[PDB]
Amino acid sequence: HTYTNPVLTGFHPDPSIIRVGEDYYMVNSTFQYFPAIVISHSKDLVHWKIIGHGITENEGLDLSDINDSHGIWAPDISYHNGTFYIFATHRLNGPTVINGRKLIRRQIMIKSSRPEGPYSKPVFIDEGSGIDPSHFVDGDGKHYMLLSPACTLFPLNEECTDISGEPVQIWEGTGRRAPEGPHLLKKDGYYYAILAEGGTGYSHSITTARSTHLYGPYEPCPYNPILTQTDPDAPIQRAGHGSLVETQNGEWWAVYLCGRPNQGSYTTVGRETALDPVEWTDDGWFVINNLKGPSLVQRAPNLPQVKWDEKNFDDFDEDTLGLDWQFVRNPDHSSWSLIERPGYLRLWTGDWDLHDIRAKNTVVRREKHHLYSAGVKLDFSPSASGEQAGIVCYYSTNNYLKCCLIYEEGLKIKVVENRSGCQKTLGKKHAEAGPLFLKAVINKQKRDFYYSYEGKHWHHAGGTEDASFLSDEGSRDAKGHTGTMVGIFANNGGSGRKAAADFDWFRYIAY
Amino acid sequence: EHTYTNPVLTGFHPDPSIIRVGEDYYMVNSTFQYFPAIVISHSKDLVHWKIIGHGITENEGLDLSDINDSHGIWAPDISYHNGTFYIFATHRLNGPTVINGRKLIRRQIMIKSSRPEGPYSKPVFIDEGSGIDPSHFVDGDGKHYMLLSPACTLFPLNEECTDISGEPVQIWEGTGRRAPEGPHLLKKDGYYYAILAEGGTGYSHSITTARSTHLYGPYEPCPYNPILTQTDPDAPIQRAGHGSLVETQNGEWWAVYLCGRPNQGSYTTVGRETALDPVEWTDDGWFVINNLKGPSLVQRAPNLPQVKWDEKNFDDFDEDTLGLDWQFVRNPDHSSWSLIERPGYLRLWTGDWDLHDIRAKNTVVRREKHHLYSAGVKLDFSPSASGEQAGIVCYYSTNNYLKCCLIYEEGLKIKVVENRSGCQKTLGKKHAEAGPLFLKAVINKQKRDFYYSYEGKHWHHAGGTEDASFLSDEGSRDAKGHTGTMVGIFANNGGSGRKAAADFDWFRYIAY
């Protein structure tokens, strides 16, 4: 078998992976999205399925006022003596006084006896000096937390709820920018230190060092960088922030984040998770894909192939939300339901439009292709100015593209962009009453919306020939760490009314 | 308990003729220059249809190799009587041809079989060139008749239906609308009902009827005429006419008929398709279609058990027989295509003629059934000299197509070429790398684009057009435009004569 990178497509940055027996588990950062920290499962390292999230209860983490691309950053999953641990940085909006100390970051620790959870309520380790916490357990069973800058080693208590001693920077890195995502690996009598360097942009790389002692000194790998993209014309870029795993058949593999530039330097679907083999060298080191950079097509891992149901069609006939969905920030559980009208995802119209950080219950999934369509069947009866419901391609509060049934002096199908903070109506068509179908068609950076009354004859509502603002780089946001998502929303245009927008189904089609 | 949206048999499916046998429904559609000829479909609920075979499958039975675009096999008629399935159809010749001393531009074909899917007998020609659209009718005494245009002209047939046995009589001339054709006769409640398609198969298409107590008339016209037509120019379904009636096993009456879906203007991109609507019998001895409202866009489904079929949108070409959703443009050259020389691949050996030539062989295409779709292939091809090419094509006729091919043209290139009403234009040409290759056509209404990939993940634009309206009956500007845009594969050597194998791993059709 062969596979083509990325193996986990769409918004899946900062991968951290473990193997427990025949099962592989991976976590990715979620930033302002809820539930926080997506957890995925695989048997073959190629095909991945979402099985849960680390933080699922609103009482565990308040993202309701967290700024775009702040919140939950690079997570780290580990397993030790029957306990699954997840650490992650929680990035605050700015300087915040917590129990007397001023911080812009907090570290989170959750744990569980099961990979999918439910995990313990988040415990905060208030070490604000760096990002990307990484759990390491030495041969003597002592627990440690690695943290940026570079490899800064903190001792932890046995429960991993607090730091038990002074930190030491055991390796400073290579001198590249923003040394982060530190990891430690113990093999062949060495401690191997792994870093992401160059920043998560187009200079991203992976560098390593080794020492016979936990606290050093560490010598740099002569093959640094052991993974990076040196070819600017390649369709995969921004390769770095890796995590290593050994299979039950003795092969070594690395997952890492990357980006797929979409008609220019635009990471439309956000940073994704790629896979490439790790080769150990006869002089005591390891490299990734023989220093060739990220592969576009690669020999599959020596593991039995197991594909999963992708759930591209959601008819909403289960009383629990599918695990591929995310809320933009914490859900308002009073204003969405799968049980008030079985067979429908109901959104009661919230008070705020998508550009407002206070907007609740935008429900979206990851874009996994640059050629796809997404459609819904909607039952909605707006009766006052601004009451609206429909579909949205969402990057941030300043960057989205929505198509909705709206009341604006009668029923209308309306297409609106927010282009880096600039709102523009792209199209507005007369709408008839009754059940309605809406369809988003994405072809690279061209996006268009269509409506239909019976799902057979489609009429253009509006679109743009330049969707590059839906990307990390095109967003022009202060931080662009997420990815374009696609889904549904409803709000009352400020009327105050609670109106039921009933979505019969959502359908995603890669073409 | 369900609804359906017209058309029920989408893509190139004109001139429907339907029968019920027991709990099964069988329908034929015209195929013009495509081979095998006369597509035969099956349904149990009148809504979901699958192709089960074709009327004419052997090259010796019908030579279309030199038949002009939209000539060939016109409206077919299927019928069942005493264990024999009969299919009649006009074969439209290129022009005046002397046959056994006589001047004809049309011949009538009869084929028969004991099974709906065939194999049917070798075509027998009934050289009556005075009209089109033969329709088999058996009166209550068991005598066989052939109805033919103009309007309802009734020919008596011998018992074997191989020859005409008497003088014709025009039993009903129609309503005065133009091109009275597609005649049918139905005996019910002591009346003979005469059915016609009138107005032409364009935007004035309609269904009109008449009745009489005697086979030979006189016939009185239906006061509800036309009982089917599209009077709303803004409706997404147009050109409604050429109907065929069926009674279900539960006593419901339904009509299939042809229609068009105009695609951003009066452009029937995928060709005429087969729609369905209920037939209501009136208390004054007539019947209408959909209560005279014209074609439905959404309709109550027939009171029949629902049976859907496998659609075969992905073909991995690992059967040794070609899937029934494929058609050849004209007769295949069997020496230059194979599913067995490299199992798992549809192999096309590069033929001698490009698609603009009527002589082109082994263009293998299926019907477009949506205005939003993509079609892709994985191709293994190694052209080494000028003009050798293979790839995907959106094909309407020899004068109207859009092709994207790996071609050797001073090195390997990905080339997109349009033939727009006979005028050829290169829309794009990109440097290509050697090795297995992926090609993708993306269709969005009248916008069409082609992409290439070396591993199926990263797609690069090869070329496209913003106005594919020439891929339609009305936009083709051909002398006759009766077919529909098809999508598929092709290979040729540009006229060099060299034989190179173009191996297609799979073909993938995705409606989005």
Ligand SMILES: [Ca+2]
């Ligand atoms: Ca539903």
Ligand SMILES: [Ca+2]
């Ligand atoms: Ca194959």
